[PDB]
Amino acid sequence: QYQFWKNFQT
């Protein structure tokens, strides 16, 4: 539910 922020932040 949060990987969307992880995979994009970089």
Swiss-Prot record:
It is found in: Cell membrane. It comes from the Eukaryota. Sulfated on at least 2 of the N-terminal tyrosines. Sulfation contributes to the efficiency of HIV-1 entry and is required for efficient binding of the chemokines, CCL3 and CCL4. O-glycosylated, but not N-glycosylated. Also sialylated glycans present which contribute to chemokine binding. Coiled coil: none annotated. Highly expressed in spleen, thymus, in the myeloid cell line THP-1, in the promyeloblastic cell line KG-1a and on CD4+ and CD8+ T-cells. Medium levels in peripheral blood leukocytes and in small intestine. Low levels in ovary and lung. Induction: (Microbial infection) May be down-regulated by human cytomegalovirus/HHV-5 protein UL78. Receptor for a number of inflammatory CC-chemokines including CCL3/MIP-1-alpha, CCL4/MIP-1-beta and RANTES and subsequently transduces a signal by increasing the intracellular calcium ion level. May play a role in the control of granulocytic lineage proliferation or differentiation. Participates in T-lymphocyte migration to the infection site by acting as a chemotactic receptor. Interacts with PRAF2. Efficient ligand binding to CCL3/MIP-1alpha and CCL4/MIP-1beta requires sulfation, O-glycosylation and sialic acid modifications. Interacts with GRK2. Interacts with ARRB1 and ARRB2. Interacts with CNIH4. Interacts with S100A4; this interaction stimulates T-lymphocyte chemotaxis. Belongs to the G-protein coupled receptor 1 family. It is linked to Type 1 diabetes mellitus 22: A multifactorial disorder of glucose homeostasis that is characterized by susceptibility to ketoacidosis in the absence of insulin therapy. Clinical features are polydipsia, polyphagia and polyuria which result from hyperglycemia-induced osmotic diuresis and secondary thirst. These derangements result in long-term complications that affect the eyes, kidneys, nerves, and blood vessels. This is C-C chemokine receptor type 5.
